[PDB]
Design a protein around this ligand. Structure first.
Ligand code: JLU
Lengths: 190, 184
């Protein structure tokens, strides 16, 4: 299917390359920038999966309480004939009542944006249900790929949610903070 | 259906973004390096499409007569939550016994690597015959998209080939020479 190929594209063309190198870049960032990403919770790549496929290019537009802080050091690699193709990731603070409640490396899964854009060219389903369904198959396929990639998969976390892009009562920052707090609770020995 | 998604992603996420800006970047390069990307033939983006989907990452190690020259100035954009995602392209000289026989911005169609990998990972359920068929469908889908694009998105040449006495540099040079003839 379409989402099946896009999930393999997302792993083969991105996650396979950047997940093994992520901790080294975070360690380099923390050494030179006063250890902003503290603890395992703040050291994963958090991948946003809006199953609505509404994907803004600026996260601050999706929620004012998500604010850009810095970039990790870039990763370069020779890729399909391009010398030093650049892979870059952005660090955000999550604000709660005007105060920083979290810090994480955060981004959208770009292929969900591709699915939506494809519908704009009348080459993929465009309806609310069709966006949700195509995104679900992509997410489940990506989940299965990562479960079969035990060597590098623990460097990322998937954050999927169904609320519409234009839903004004939905807090993306609160959605991320809920995941981060749950991750920290799993660290307690009980 | 795999190829349909990959080809549209290649257009939506790459070609539609960089082709309208490619001439300006080449012009910037040509202004500081003595119109070395000369003639209309050196102004296009050349995209290698090996139909078996075997895509080396290093072009100079694939054929020593394909020699890295320079990066174009890079192009950046905010993309899906990433600030200043970087788009970069490489210029190469094609040599014959030391003589420059052509110069161009040259690369492989990266999504062919996804088709190849799916044919090697048993979890993907994707055979070599599937790979070869989707590779042809990817090429045809991309050709259709580019044919429907504005003249601002049209400045690229797809070089599709089957490798059976094979020179990759000669494969490119044959297309560059044909274009030079259709100029005059
Ligand atoms: N966050 C994030 N940062 C990244 O740096 C990144 N790189 C990959 N990916 C993800 C894996 C998908 C497939 O990656 P890939 O196998 O390279 O296929 C590309 C390639 F053929 C071409 N292309 C695009 N950009 C470029 C470029 N700079 N240079 C050359 N060619 C370029 O367009 C296709 C579709 O790209 P898209 O962004 O839509 O989907 C990406 C999303 C990324 N994600």
């Amino acid at each position: 299917n379409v989402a099946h190929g896009l999930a393999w594209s997302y792993y083969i063309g991105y996650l396979r390359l950047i997940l093994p190198e992520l901790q080294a870049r975070i360690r380099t960032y923390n050494q030179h920038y006063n250890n902003l990403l503290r603890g395992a919770v703040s050291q994963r790549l958090y991948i946003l999966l809006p199953l609505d496929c509404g994907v803004p290019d600026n996260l601050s537009m999706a929620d004012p309480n998500i604010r850009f802080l810095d970039k990790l050091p870039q990763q370069t690699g020779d890729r399909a004939g391009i010398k030093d193709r650049v892979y870059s990731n952005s660090i955000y603070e999550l604000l709660e009542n005007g105060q920083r409640a979290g810090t994480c490396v955060l981004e959208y899964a770009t292929p969900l944006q591709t699915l939506f854009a494809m519908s704009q060219y009348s080459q993929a389903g465009f309806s609310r249900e069709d966006r949700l369904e195509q995104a679900k198959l992509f997410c489940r396929t990506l989940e299965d790929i990562l479960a079969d990639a035990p060597e590098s998969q623990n460097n990322c976390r998937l954050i999927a949610y169904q609320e519409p892009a234009d839903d004004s009562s939905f807090s993306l920052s609160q959605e991320v903070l809920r995941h981060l707090r749950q991750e920290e609770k799993e660290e307690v020995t009980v």
